[PDB]
RNA sequence: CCCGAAAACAGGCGGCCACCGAGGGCCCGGGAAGAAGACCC
RNA sequence: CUGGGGAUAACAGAGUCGUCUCGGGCGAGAGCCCAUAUCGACCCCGAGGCUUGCUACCUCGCUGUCGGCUCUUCCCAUCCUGGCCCUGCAGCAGGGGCCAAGGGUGGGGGUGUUCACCCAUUAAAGGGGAACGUGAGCUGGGUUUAGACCGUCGUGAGACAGGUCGGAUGCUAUCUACCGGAGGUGUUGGCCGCCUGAGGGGAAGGCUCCCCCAGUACGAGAGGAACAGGGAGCCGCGGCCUCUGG
RNA sequence: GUUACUCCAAAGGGUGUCCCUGGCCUUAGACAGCGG
């Protein structure tokens, strides 16, 4: 389908009301949580965006599948909790040509809008699978339209990424 | 047809899997492309 | 600026005579002379008390490297005039025995893989080649001369057209100045 | 006329000073032009001067940029570039210049000059090339 | 040597002139089913814009069979030229020419078909292909 | 698209009439034999012989057919010695010495000859030249030569030229020159039988010609022939660049060009118009003479093949500057027949 | 190999005149050259 | 038919690049096992302006055009020719990649064709730009007038980005540009002759086959090389008329 | 590079060099060589 540079940017009003949008599509990604959901893990590992992005559900489902397969074969289900935090509400538009007579896009897809320093995904994991958590994060970071950065939060919600990296 | 004398000087080489270039034996990255993936020159038929 | 005033000394042995003259080091010993030219801005070379001193008064990384490099070169020259350098090569053949000969300033290898045309490898001034059976010696007094001679003889016999897992014949280096070669 | 010995000197700075002289009304002779230096890297410099030699007018080469291959002409051409060439003033200033490879007998036995502002002494880098090297690369005599 | 005891080729010193271009009809002099042939190409020839390929005595050509017996027509064959009407110089300077344009049908590797050439043939053909002189009872 | 090579060579441009009728030799070969590196003559005609092949390649040892050009060469007169020194860019003349008693017909070319100039002054000037050559300021020595057409009856106005000498040294050259000045040179003293030569001359005039004949342009289709554009080319070029290029074939002068030709074998040098085969003495001039050239009287060369120019034109030969590695031997090949029949 | 002293540092050598006359052109008989001019004997 | 319009399309230009051609990152998985010999999904990031579209900034009497023939030149993202590296490279070969733009890249069948398809050869029979190079250079098959026929649509006059037959081709070169030929002035006195050679041009040469090496190395056998050495021809270039033809 | 703007390339990478920060080691540390 059509490139993602056409839908990256945020300079455009929100278009999230299905009781007025005729023909609005339906989601592809329908699973946002994985692994052991009831859990008390130690280390939290989340992607933050470096600038405002607009991420398609194609990309989200790609990320989901890849990361979950990787962690299922390298960690196991009872030892990781994987979550996607953002739902696609933004409807994307395309002009059906007539030319530029009556230009107003008919809907094709969905996207999630994300602002600077916002979380996208999260892997909760013990202390002896951090290597795998960070490999997962690399794989995910590789599939986004703009850049991203990760941290490592403790319970009590504190940043320990440095103290943890320096020792592993 | 064995000649260790010859193997030691034909087959102490690395190959980058990206550009194909040849690097010395103890390299850690390629000297052209910066790739970190280096394999050794096949000394026995693989396949 | 890693440091302030890097300097390194070289102890001079009994029979050797080192002397600098306009960015040109000259070394005399029990056999032969060896001169060379070591130039870099801010690097000095002199003799204080029986030593050779190399000095630089506020180095970056690429000055440190150059200074230790010059050190190695002058050590090489000293040990060369004092003992000399010796190299060994080996000859291997499956079919088509070849014959290696010296004549003047060349090394002629004939019947290599059945060729009707010989192969010529150059000798350099100050180096002596010596064939003894299937083993070859290259002796000399300048490290670089002896290495280049050995390497010319080895490169004389190179293949680019067929599999070298099956076609392995040639002449090979097996000791580069006392150190072996293993794989 | 003033006589200037290009030996250890930098080409562009030499030329700048000489061109101001010429315009202020003197006569200049340059000797040992093969011994001035050019700073940079060898590949870069050679590429530049080759790309210049192989410029020419596609319809008629009896026109055309006639960029030279000799050392004295390289020097003369730099100086020219530093003057108003499309003007009587500049043409006269340029006619007041003469450049030689070596030191002819005519000038032998005379005291030369050196421009302070141009000299290899200023440098901090061992990267320099000589105009004679450039000429040999391009295929010029001396 | 490698294999010379029984071979098919040889060297002539003359190199005759090229007089028979593409589209030319040659008679067949051998006792194969073919009677007439048309030249459609010349083996071992490279040319330029708008030029046709042309052959002379001793040259092999790719041909079509126009007239002949049913199992030979509309077939592509290879043939060696043995005669031509246009002249060509011999070493001593004298020049030579024949009465018509004839060919013998052969195999793509020199071995001939047939068993007898009715008529004379040129010496250069027989010098270049050593199995033809073994068939013809007149060589000049 | 379709590709073909361009029509004509850009290596013989500008294709213009020659600056002179007497040719010009720009470069000279590296010879060790101290001798004059060339000779000159007038061209007479063509004929053919039969010889046993001496040259490498099949056809060796057989009787073949060889066409031949006869070049008439009376002796030369040596009248000058000329020294060269090195200047800022290249060589430059330094001194000349001429001989005193020169023919009455040399003033047909050089009107202004000297007046007193006796042997006293000639020998003094020679001595000065020698005392200069023994110093060191000298780079090479050459000879000044003129032809003598009055011997064969062709003309009177002569040709004047400058030839070089073989060797790495200059004092050997000066000894040779000082010995040769004031006298005549014959071709046998200089050229050997069997040498390869380069021939140098000026070609025949054809006039103003069109591009079909002058560059090889293809004649156009028969509709254009009926339109008035058959022997014309189609395009002077494209829209951009918006000028005509110098590579586009046009009409102009065809012929009378200064040309050179490499590696022509000298077969025979004769004496007084006769060729002495192994067996018997024979003449070369055919029955009825040569067309447009009369009878041969003085001396002559056989040259294998063709050379540039019309019959009575001045030719200049030199030893080959660009020879191969597989040379034929230096000796008169076995000749079995020479044609004396009428060539008209 | 071909062109090339208009290469503006617009060259070098030898010789002849000038400080009446060195040389050159027209003209005449022709072509080995040629659209006029030029070129050659 | 008139009056007018680049206030407004088809045609080439400019702008843009969704589409287009040429690429890249990551590593799922496939490859006897082995993520990277080869392939590389899903997702993400780009170059060029040689397809097509969008817009409507220039031009409505400048010229309106497709293909072909002739002629010159350029880019490299390389088809052969030179040189190299990896291989799931024994040899013969194949696959994939690096440097390299000096030379070459042809002939024919049906069709108006460009492309595409087919034949026989060949070392190989690369792709693009130049106002979709080139009508003050030709042609004139197609397309867009006026004549007529068929099929559909229409009450009809009539239409069809549906088919078919037929259907005008102007110039004495003002300025520049190029090919060739002459006459002047200058070069600080005039004239003969002979030389240097700054610079500029060059493909002046490019390719293939045969013998031998050798039925050798390699290979279980089938099959089957290379360096050196000898010879011949094709394409291109420059000349000559003794021989042969006109 | 020698570009205020008019007219100028990315994701992805780098013991290229110059700097900040924080852990672990250290009078025998981190490579070597001699042996278990
Ligand atoms: Zn690589």
Coordinates of C-alpha atoms in Angstrom, one line a residue, chain D residues 59 62 72 100-101 141-142, chain F residues 14 88-89 243-246:
Chain D
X59 CA 31.9 22.6 -31.4
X62 CA 40.4 26.2 -31.5
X72 CA 55.3 28.4 -15.0
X100 CA 60.6 31.1 -15.3
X101 CA 61.4 27.5 -14.5
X141 CA 57.6 19.3 -20.1
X142 CA 59.6 20.4 -17.0
Chain F
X14 CA 42.4 19.8 -40.8
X88 CA 64.4 27.2 -22.6
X89 CA 61.8 25.0 -24.4
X243 CA 25.9 25.4 -33.6
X244 CA 27.5 23.2 -36.2
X245 CA 30.2 21.0 -34.8
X246 CA 33.6 20.4 -36.5

